Every structure is written in C-alpha cells, then in structure tokens.
C-alpha cells in the first residue's frame, strides 16, 4: 500500500535499478520502493498511476537521468507532473553514466547526484540513503 | 457453464494458448478458460459467442497480441466489443513475441504484460495468474 | 430522448440524409430520426452511443450503403453490433447511387430498398415510411 | 473568479479564439471564458495554472486542435493533465481548419466539433453553446 | 524613497523605458518607477544597489528582455539576485522586439508580457498596470 | 550546522581541496569547513545555498583561483554575491599553481595568498590558518 | 439618472472615447459619463437627447474636436445648443491628434486642453480630471 519513493527510469536502464534495489532494500535501511514492472498488475489504466501512486502513496520521486531518458515521453510527462505537484524535496535526479547529450534544461534548478566522478564516488550511497529516509 | 477469462487469439498462435492452459489450469491455481476450438460445438451462430459468452459467462478477457492478430477481422470485432461493453479491469493484453509491426492504437491506454524482455521474465506468470485470479 | 431510427451514413453522404430529413420529418408523417451531427453533444465517448443510442433509444437502424461506406470502420462496427442484437426487422439497408463495387456480403440476407431505378421512384418513400412507422 | 471553459490553443491561432469570444460572450448566451493572454497576470508561475485554473476554477476544457498545435509543448502537457484528471465530459476538441496531418491519436475516443464542412455549419455554434452551458 | 518596480534594461534600450514612463507615470495611473540613470546620484558604489534598492526599497522587478540584454553582466547579476531573493510573483519579464536568439532559459518558468504580436496589443498596458499595482 | 568558511572551487581541481581539508581539519587547529559535494543533500534548491549557507551559517569565504575557475558561472555568481554581502575580511583568494591567464579584475583589490613562488612557501599554511581562526 | 459630462464625438474616433472611459472611471476618480452608443435605447426620438440629456441631466459637455468632427451635422447642432444654454464652464474642447485643417472658429474663445504637444502631455489627464470633477 504505502511506499517511500516512486522511481522514474527508462526501460533500457534496468540493471542500475536492480542494483539500487539490492543496495537499499536489502541493507539494514529497510526502504520500500515502487517499480512499475514489479508491482503493477496488467490491465490497469495508465492515467491512474499518476493520480493515485505518485499523488497519495509515495513521498519522493527518483528520476534516473540518461541519454535514453531523453526520448521517452511517459517519463517526461511524469517528471512534469511531479514538478507541478509542488522543504519536502520531492524530486531526486540521479546521473550514473557518462552521458553525451546535454543535461535537460527542466532539471537545472536542482542539485543532481553524480556517480561518474572518481574522486566523489565515496559519498553517493550514503547521501542517497539519508535523502530517501528523511521524514 | 461459468468461466474465468475468455481468450482472443489468431489461429496462427495456438502453441502459446496450449502453454497458458498447461501453466494456469493444471497447476494448483485451478483456473477455467474458455477456448473457442474446445467448448463451442459446430453449427452455432457466430453472433451468439459475443452476446452470450463474453457478456454473461466469462468474467474477463485476455487478448494475445501478435503480427497475425492485426490481419484478422473477427479478433478486431471481439476486441472492440469488450471495450464497448464497459475497476474490474476486464481486458488483459499479452505480448510474447518479437513483433515487427506497431502496437495497436486502440490498446494504448492499458498496461501490457510483456514477455520479450529478458530481464523481466521472472514476474510474468505470477503477475498474470494474480490478475486473472483477482475477483 | 426517444427516437424511431438510428441513421448510419458515410460522412461524404450528407445531402441524401438532409433529403431524407426533408421528406420524412418535415412532412406530415411526423417521424423522428437521430442524426449524429445534430443530436450528439461534443465531447461524448464513442463507446457509449453503441450501447445507449442503438441499444435502448432507437428502434430501427437505417444503413445508407454507398461506395465510400466500405472505407469507414465506425459504420462497420455499428452494423455488426446491430446484427449481433437480433420478425422485428431491425435493419434497413438503403441504396441510392450507382456502385461500381460489389454489395457487402454481410447484408445479403436482407431486402434492400433500392432507389436508382427510374420507374420505382413512386414506391420508395411510401415503403420507407410504412416500414419505419411500424410498432 | 470562476469560469466555464479553459481554452487551450496554439498562439499561432488567435483569430479563431477572437471569433469564439465574439460569438459566445458578446452574444446573448452570457458565457464566461478564461483566455490565458487576457486573464493571466504576467510573472505567474507556469505550474500553478494547471493545478489551480484547469482543476479547481474552470469547469470544462476546450482544445482548439490545429496543425501548429502539434509542436507546442505546453498544450500537450495541459491536454494530458486534463485527461488524467478525468459522464461530465471535461474535454471538447474543436477543429476549424484543413489539416494535412493525422489527427492526434490521443483524441480518438472523443467526438470532435468540426467546422470546415460547408454543409453542417448551421449546428456548430448551437451544439457548442449547448455543450458549454450544461452543469 | 519608496517605489513600485525596479527596472532592469540594457543601455541600448532607452526609448522603450522612456515610453513606459510616459504611459505609466504621466498618465492617470500614478505609479512610481526607479530608473537607474535618473534617480541614482553619481559616485555610488555598485554593490549597494542590490542590497539596498532592490532588496528593501522597490517591491517588484521588471526585466526588459532584448537581444543585447544577453551581453551585459550587470543585468545577469541583478536578475539572479532577484530570483535568489524569492506566490507574490515579484518578477515580470517584458518582450517588445523581434529576437534572433532563443529566449533565456533562466526565465522560462514565468509568464512573459509579449508586445510584438499585432493582435494582443490591446491588453498589454492594462495587464502590466494591473500586475504592478497590486499590494 | 555552524561553520567557519565556505569553499568555492571548480570541480576540475579537488585534490587541493582534499589537501586543505587534511591540513586544516585533522590537525590541532580543529577547523570545520563546508564542502558542497560532502554535506549538501541531493534534491535541494540551488538558490538556497547562497541565501542560507553563505549568509547565516559560514563566517568567511575562501576562493580557490585557477584557470578553470574563470570558466564556471556558478562560482562567479557566488563570489559576486559574497562581495555584495559586505574589518571582518570575509573573502580569501588562494593561488596554488602557475596560471597562464590574467588574474580576475574583480579580486584585484584584496591581498591573495600565493603558493607558486618558491621563496615564501614556508609562510603559507600558518598564515592562511591564522586568518581563518580569527574571531 | 444623473451624470457628470456629455460627450460629443464623431463616430470615426471611438478608441479615444474608450481611453477616456478607462482613464476617467476605472480609477479612484469614480466619474460618470453618458455615451450615446451605450446609454441610449433604440427607438428614441432624436429631439429628446438635446432637451432632456444635455439640459437637465448632464452638468458639462466635452467635445472631442477632430478633422472628421467638421463633417457631421449633428455635432454642430449639439455644440450650438450647448452654447445657447449659456463661470460654470459648461464646455470643454479636447484636441488629441494632428489636424491638417484650421481649428473651428466658434470654439476660439475657449482654452483647449491640447494633447499633441510632446512637452506638455504630462499635465493632460491630471488637468482634465480636475476640470471635470470641479463642481
């Protein structure tokens, strides 16, 4: 029923989502995440996952930015809906791969979390855990 | 007498229907499925299977989408009739093959249960069975 | 509210529909016809007119068969839905123009009301009104 | 404060919006329309329009579909937001020009109010006003 | 001492701000505008304007966006300070000329007051005065 | 919470920042600095790290000047904001390597702490830390 | 019932009358003006708007002098009737645009309120409003 964060990812980036699941749910942090391909039964109407899950179930939303994320339209609509929804910090961008295309202009007002800098990799997961577990 | 899910499929795809029968009917789920070539005696009128079986006997409908599904007219009529009939989620599309054509525009508002993605095949049968066994 | 006959026509055939309105509605017969472009408010869902108007509002369905009638799909779905419903004679095909393509094979067990014969023009409207005015 | 219809139009088509306001507000119907370029103060945030005007202030939404409408990006978001939000028919598509592109596939379940037909122009404004004046 | 709107303009655009003075101050509106090179004594330190004039003297900030506005750095710093300072919508962008460069992405979440359209010019001054006359 | 100095650096030179942390924090001086990539949770708004951290938390600001520092706009805005903010000596420029580009003219009115000249490097760290430890 | 000023204008210049409305009774002045095309019901006799409105209802009369004002024959009669009526200053000529023809001779003994001189437009509205509001 209740969750802790919705996750918006392009379908071509699934290994990183699985790694996120292993690193956050299985550790002693005990976080609950909603993945569309895992706990959404077939036959549901698309226009309900935005008005029911993101609205009244999850508390944050984690956007996995990538080059392939810039071609899907469902992710774009979900990002705009999350922005138009509303201190709480209800949006967390994440970049993890060396992307060649320009960073989206919509998400330029929020501090991104980076994983491709060798001198800063030691803070990534410990920052994510507390950002997601903040009340 | 009664049933749990009418099945719509092109005759070019019957091995998958047999596999569905094996997986859903002969397991401890104990489901009942209505197949046209197995529960319809010859000599019946075509215009009765739509107004009697899909409406007053079957409780949901499962549509097996494929490239040969687009070439048949009977399946198109049976698809449109189900939508015209009417929370209950009385329509479940299924994609199981590497199709080279475009997904039908009529069924673009319903979540599909995909089988061709190798990283998500571990949830297919369980999700399908839960959806079909939902009251 | 209540009508006497739903009208199924190609959008390229509107002059004949207007002529039918003039000859049957504005005459002393005082019949009622439900034309889509005159009695349907904008913004309605397509799958409601088939289960509300054709089902429980109109009593008969008049199909204006023409060459371009074979291209539209809404007319095909409406014709098949009307046939699936059922001595009452709840379907009247009307031919008014010379066709260079074969008459539809689904409408071959029904007596069409031909108009193009230059000697039977006197019986056309009388037969049509007598058929429509039956209880 | 309150309105009756939020109008979604491409900024390349303002003459038809002026015609609409002339024929519906300055006439004896006494309707109220919320035009962005007339009733929105400068310096407002974009994300408040969707969540305050379209949802809780206006009562219906009228989409002026055209060829240049397909390239604007805020119109798509507004249309999808309205669709996700919602018998009351909170959407009315209006076509007034000769389009050489395909009609938007997201709007294929709704009856459009066409204007380019030189025969049915008599019912256009009557149907539009009757639709807008409903509670 | 007190004002109503600080004005940020490129020095290449002085005719338009003179016209703005002519239309809003000398008219019957009775509004006060703080022009940079008309109400500031020479010899003042630059870093006091942002912390004293924009911060605690004016109430809103108007930005005359133009092609040469993208060259000056003082305008960039003033715009960024205004944005970092703060619902109450204390930032109004004004476009009045044909630009050959893309509109700045910093000011994309707010509604510009366009003037170059030859049809909406009627509402321009009324909207501007109503916007900046609010408490 | 409370800090002693805000550090402004380009991402291209973080090894010097690591060395500065080692030399000033882990010694007997026991200073505490603020690094963006270390104690700034993701999802926070950019326009608050300037109006909340630099103003109400830190007491002074260290600026690491190099060739790559002249290419980043965020550092330029931060140093201009700090300069506009204000005996306290709330700005300390640090030169640590041979730069072949001209020194910025904004900072040409403040004594810099130099590390390149191989005759005063014995006067560097104690002199730098005495400034930061001042009340 | 009561009024404050009758307005004599040729139909060719109504935009200036709209501007006068906006600047005179949309502000805190709260004036009342009698416009023929807004306060005269159809079917009235022409000879009553002179002996009823100008005489016993309005307190003053403003004449929008223009080049086209010398073509209409009703304005001459209205002006001469006002003059024949009568300190109270019951006539205010107003000149706003350049004229290629001499000023009317009948109106030579009265000081006009000029608007076309670029050095004196700062007094126009504030003087005209005081004149109209004077008892």
CSV table of N, CA, C and O in Angstrom, one decimal, chain A residues 23-88:
chain,number,residue,atom,x,y,z
A,23,UNK,N,21.0,-2.5,-3.1
A,23,UNK,CA,21.7,-1.7,-2.2
A,23,UNK,C,20.9,-1.0,-1.2
A,23,UNK,O,21.4,-0.6,-0.1
A,24,UNK,N,19.6,-0.8,-1.4
A,24,UNK,CA,18.7,0.0,-0.5
A,24,UNK,C,17.7,-0.9,0.2
A,24,UNK,O,17.5,-0.7,1.4
A,25,UNK,N,17.0,-1.8,-0.4
A,25,UNK,CA,16.0,-2.6,0.2
A,25,UNK,C,16.6,-3.7,1.1
A,25,UNK,O,16.2,-3.9,2.2
A,26,UNK,N,17.7,-4.3,0.6
A,26,UNK,CA,18.3,-5.5,1.3
A,26,UNK,C,19.2,-5.1,2.4
A,26,UNK,O,19.5,-5.9,3.2
A,27,UNK,N,19.6,-3.8,2.5
A,27,UNK,CA,20.5,-3.4,3.5
A,27,UNK,C,19.7,-3.1,4.8
A,27,UNK,O,18.4,-3.1,4.7
A,28,UNK,N,20.3,-2.7,5.9
A,28,UNK,CA,19.5,-2.5,7.1
A,28,UNK,C,18.7,-1.2,7.1
A,28,UNK,O,18.1,-0.8,8.1
A,29,UNK,N,18.7,-0.5,6.0
A,29,UNK,CA,18.0,0.7,5.9
A,29,UNK,C,16.5,0.5,5.8
A,29,UNK,O,15.7,1.3,6.3
A,30,UNK,N,16.1,-0.6,5.1
A,30,UNK,CA,14.7,-1.1,5.1
A,30,UNK,C,13.8,0.0,4.4
A,30,UNK,O,12.8,0.5,5.0
A,31,UNK,N,14.1,0.3,3.2
A,31,UNK,CA,13.3,1.2,2.4
A,31,UNK,C,12.4,0.4,1.4
A,31,UNK,O,12.8,-0.7,0.9
A,32,UNK,N,11.2,1.0,1.1
A,32,UNK,CA,10.3,0.4,0.2
A,32,UNK,C,10.1,1.2,-1.1
A,32,UNK,O,9.8,2.4,-1.0
A,33,UNK,N,10.4,0.6,-2.2
A,33,UNK,CA,10.3,1.4,-3.5
A,33,UNK,C,9.3,0.7,-4.4
A,33,UNK,O,9.0,-0.5,-4.3
A,34,UNK,N,8.7,1.5,-5.3
A,34,UNK,CA,7.7,1.1,-6.2
A,34,UNK,C,8.3,1.1,-7.6
A,34,UNK,O,8.6,2.1,-8.2
A,35,UNK,N,8.4,-0.1,-8.2
A,35,UNK,CA,8.8,-0.3,-9.5
A,35,UNK,C,7.6,-0.8,-10.4
A,35,UNK,O,6.9,-1.7,-10.0
A,36,UNK,N,7.5,-0.1,-11.5
A,36,UNK,CA,6.3,-0.3,-12.3
A,36,UNK,C,6.2,-1.8,-12.8
A,36,UNK,O,5.1,-2.4,-12.8
A,37,UNK,N,7.3,-2.3,-13.3
A,37,UNK,CA,7.4,-3.7,-13.8
A,37,UNK,C,7.4,-4.8,-12.7
A,37,UNK,O,7.6,-5.9,-13.1
A,38,UNK,N,7.1,-4.4,-11.5
A,38,UNK,CA,7.2,-5.4,-10.4
A,38,UNK,C,5.9,-5.5,-9.6
A,38,UNK,O,5.5,-6.6,-9.2
A,39,UNK,N,5.2,-4.4,-9.3
A,39,UNK,CA,4.0,-4.4,-8.5
A,39,UNK,C,2.9,-3.6,-9.1
A,39,UNK,O,2.2,-2.9,-8.4
A,40,UNK,N,2.7,-3.7,-10.4
A,40,UNK,CA,1.6,-3.1,-11.2
A,40,UNK,C,1.0,-4.1,-12.0
A,40,UNK,O,1.6,-4.5,-13.0
A,41,UNK,N,-0.2,-4.6,-11.7
A,41,UNK,CA,-0.8,-5.7,-12.4
A,41,UNK,C,-1.2,-5.2,-13.8
A,41,UNK,O,-1.6,-4.1,-14.0
A,42,UNK,N,-1.2,-6.1,-14.8
A,42,UNK,CA,-1.7,-5.8,-16.1
A,42,UNK,C,-3.2,-5.5,-16.1
A,42,UNK,O,-3.9,-6.0,-15.3
A,43,UNK,N,-3.6,-4.6,-17.1
A,43,UNK,CA,-4.9,-4.2,-17.2
A,43,UNK,C,-5.3,-2.9,-16.5
A,43,UNK,O,-6.4,-2.4,-16.7
A,44,UNK,N,-4.4,-2.3,-15.8
A,44,UNK,CA,-4.6,-1.1,-15.1
A,44,UNK,C,-4.5,0.1,-16.2
A,44,UNK,O,-3.8,0.0,-17.1
A,45,UNK,N,-5.3,1.1,-15.9
A,45,UNK,CA,-5.3,2.3,-16.8
A,45,UNK,C,-4.1,3.2,-16.5
A,45,UNK,O,-3.8,3.5,-15.3
A,46,UNK,N,-3.4,3.7,-17.6
A,46,UNK,CA,-2.2,4.4,-17.4
A,46,UNK,C,-2.5,5.7,-16.6
A,46,UNK,O,-1.6,6.2,-15.8
A,47,UNK,N,-3.6,6.3,-16.9
A,47,UNK,CA,-3.9,7.6,-16.3
A,47,UNK,C,-4.2,7.5,-14.8
A,47,UNK,O,-4.6,8.6,-14.2
A,48,UNK,N,-4.0,6.4,-14.1
A,48,UNK,CA,-4.3,6.2,-12.7
A,48,UNK,C,-3.0,6.1,-11.9
A,48,UNK,O,-3.0,6.5,-10.7
A,49,UNK,N,-1.9,5.7,-12.5
A,49,UNK,CA,-0.6,5.6,-11.8
A,49,UNK,C,-0.1,6.9,-11.4
A,49,UNK,O,0.7,7.0,-10.4
A,50,UNK,N,-0.4,8.0,-12.2
A,50,UNK,CA,0.0,9.3,-11.8
A,50,UNK,C,-0.9,10.0,-10.8
A,50,UNK,O,-0.4,10.8,-10.0
A,51,UNK,N,-2.2,9.7,-10.8
A,51,UNK,CA,-3.1,10.4,-9.9
A,51,UNK,C,-3.3,9.6,-8.6
A,51,UNK,O,-4.0,10.1,-7.7
A,52,UNK,N,-2.8,8.4,-8.5
A,52,UNK,CA,-3.0,7.6,-7.3
A,52,UNK,C,-1.7,7.2,-6.6
A,52,UNK,O,-1.6,7.4,-5.4
A,53,UNK,N,-0.7,6.7,-7.4
A,53,UNK,CA,0.5,6.3,-6.8
A,53,UNK,C,1.4,7.5,-6.4
A,53,UNK,O,1.7,7.7,-5.2
A,54,UNK,N,1.8,8.3,-7.4
A,54,UNK,CA,2.6,9.5,-7.2
A,54,UNK,C,2.0,10.5,-6.3
A,54,UNK,O,2.7,11.3,-5.6
A,55,UNK,N,0.6,10.6,-6.3
A,55,UNK,CA,-0.1,11.6,-5.5
A,55,UNK,C,-0.3,11.2,-4.1
A,55,UNK,O,0.0,12.0,-3.2
A,56,UNK,N,-0.8,10.0,-3.8
A,56,UNK,CA,-1.2,9.7,-2.4
A,56,UNK,C,-0.4,8.5,-1.8
A,56,UNK,O,-0.7,8.1,-0.6
A,57,UNK,N,0.5,7.8,-2.5
A,57,UNK,CA,1.2,6.7,-2.0
A,57,UNK,C,2.6,6.9,-1.7
A,57,UNK,O,3.1,6.8,-0.6
A,58,UNK,N,3.4,7.4,-2.7
A,58,UNK,CA,4.8,7.7,-2.5
A,58,UNK,C,5.0,9.0,-1.8
A,58,UNK,O,4.1,9.9,-1.8
A,59,UNK,N,6.2,9.2,-1.3
A,59,UNK,CA,6.6,10.5,-0.7
A,59,UNK,C,7.7,11.3,-1.5
A,59,UNK,O,7.7,12.5,-1.4
A,60,UNK,N,8.5,10.6,-2.2
A,60,UNK,CA,9.5,11.2,-3.1
A,60,UNK,C,9.4,10.6,-4.5
A,60,UNK,O,8.7,9.6,-4.7
A,61,UNK,N,10.2,11.1,-5.4
A,61,UNK,CA,10.3,10.5,-6.7
A,61,UNK,C,11.8,10.7,-7.2
A,61,UNK,O,12.3,11.8,-7.2
A,62,UNK,N,12.4,9.5,-7.6
A,62,UNK,CA,13.8,9.5,-8.0
A,62,UNK,C,13.8,9.3,-9.5
A,62,UNK,O,13.3,8.3,-10.1
A,63,UNK,N,14.4,10.3,-10.2
A,63,UNK,CA,14.5,10.3,-11.7
A,63,UNK,C,15.9,9.9,-12.1
A,63,UNK,O,16.9,10.5,-11.8
A,64,UNK,N,16.0,8.8,-12.9
A,64,UNK,CA,17.2,8.2,-13.3
A,64,UNK,C,17.5,8.9,-14.7
A,64,UNK,O,16.9,8.5,-15.7
A,65,UNK,N,18.4,9.9,-14.7
A,65,UNK,CA,18.6,10.6,-16.0
A,65,UNK,C,19.7,9.9,-16.8
A,65,UNK,O,20.6,9.4,-16.3
A,66,UNK,N,19.5,9.9,-18.1
A,66,UNK,CA,20.4,9.3,-19.0
A,66,UNK,C,20.1,9.8,-20.4
A,66,UNK,O,19.2,10.6,-20.6
A,67,UNK,N,20.9,9.3,-21.4
A,67,UNK,CA,20.6,9.7,-22.8
A,67,UNK,C,19.3,9.1,-23.3
A,67,UNK,O,18.6,9.7,-24.1
A,68,UNK,N,19.0,7.8,-23.0
A,68,UNK,CA,17.8,7.2,-23.4
A,68,UNK,C,16.6,7.7,-22.7
A,68,UNK,O,15.5,7.6,-23.2
A,69,UNK,N,16.8,8.4,-21.5
A,69,UNK,CA,15.7,9.0,-20.8
A,69,UNK,C,15.1,10.2,-21.6
A,69,UNK,O,14.0,10.6,-21.3
A,70,UNK,N,15.9,10.8,-22.5
A,70,UNK,CA,15.5,12.0,-23.2
A,70,UNK,C,14.6,11.7,-24.4
A,70,UNK,O,14.2,12.6,-25.1
A,71,UNK,N,14.3,10.4,-24.7
A,71,UNK,CA,13.5,10.0,-25.8
A,71,UNK,C,12.1,9.5,-25.4
A,71,UNK,O,11.2,9.5,-26.2
A,72,UNK,N,12.0,9.0,-24.2
A,72,UNK,CA,10.7,8.5,-23.7
A,72,UNK,C,9.8,9.7,-23.3
A,72,UNK,O,10.3,10.7,-22.8
A,73,UNK,N,8.5,9.6,-23.6
A,73,UNK,CA,7.5,10.6,-23.3
A,73,UNK,C,6.8,10.4,-22.0
A,73,UNK,O,6.4,11.4,-21.4
A,74,UNK,N,6.6,9.1,-21.6
A,74,UNK,CA,6.0,8.9,-20.3
A,74,UNK,C,6.8,9.4,-19.2
A,74,UNK,O,6.3,10.0,-18.2
A,75,UNK,N,8.1,9.2,-19.2
A,75,UNK,CA,9.0,9.8,-18.2
A,75,UNK,C,8.9,11.3,-18.2
A,75,UNK,O,8.9,11.9,-17.1
A,76,UNK,N,8.9,12.0,-19.4
A,76,UNK,CA,8.8,13.4,-19.4
A,76,UNK,C,7.5,13.9,-18.8
A,76,UNK,O,7.5,14.8,-18.0
A,77,UNK,N,6.4,13.2,-19.1
A,77,UNK,CA,5.1,13.6,-18.5
A,77,UNK,C,5.1,13.4,-17.0
A,77,UNK,O,4.6,14.2,-16.2
A,78,UNK,N,5.7,12.3,-16.5
A,78,UNK,CA,5.7,12.0,-15.1
A,78,UNK,C,6.6,13.1,-14.4
A,78,UNK,O,6.2,13.5,-13.3
A,79,UNK,N,7.7,13.5,-15.0
A,79,UNK,CA,8.6,14.5,-14.4
A,79,UNK,C,7.8,15.8,-14.3
A,79,UNK,O,7.8,16.5,-13.2
A,80,UNK,N,7.1,16.2,-15.4
A,80,UNK,CA,6.3,17.4,-15.3
A,80,UNK,C,5.2,17.4,-14.3
A,80,UNK,O,4.9,18.3,-13.6
A,81,UNK,N,4.5,16.2,-14.2
A,81,UNK,CA,3.5,16.1,-13.2
A,81,UNK,C,4.1,16.2,-11.7
A,81,UNK,O,3.5,16.8,-10.9
A,82,UNK,N,5.2,15.6,-11.5
A,82,UNK,CA,5.9,15.6,-10.2
A,82,UNK,C,6.2,17.1,-9.9
A,82,UNK,O,6.1,17.5,-8.7
A,83,UNK,N,6.8,17.8,-10.9
A,83,UNK,CA,7.1,19.2,-10.6
A,83,UNK,C,5.9,20.0,-10.3
A,83,UNK,O,5.8,20.8,-9.4
A,84,UNK,N,4.8,19.9,-11.1
A,84,UNK,CA,3.6,20.6,-10.9
A,84,UNK,C,2.9,20.2,-9.6
A,84,UNK,O,2.0,21.0,-9.2
A,85,UNK,N,3.2,19.1,-9.0
A,85,UNK,CA,2.6,18.7,-7.8
A,85,UNK,C,2.9,19.7,-6.7
A,85,UNK,O,2.0,20.1,-5.9
A,86,UNK,N,4.1,20.2,-6.6
A,86,UNK,CA,4.5,21.2,-5.6
A,86,UNK,C,5.8,21.8,-6.0
A,86,UNK,O,6.9,21.3,-5.9
A,87,UNK,N,11.1,22.3,0.7
A,87,UNK,CA,11.2,21.8,2.1
A,87,UNK,C,11.2,20.3,2.1
A,87,UNK,O,12.0,19.6,2.7
A,88,UNK,N,10.1,19.7,1.5
A,88,UNK,CA,10.0,18.3,1.4
A,88,UNK,C,11.0,17.7,0.4
A,88,UNK,O,11.4,16.5,0.6
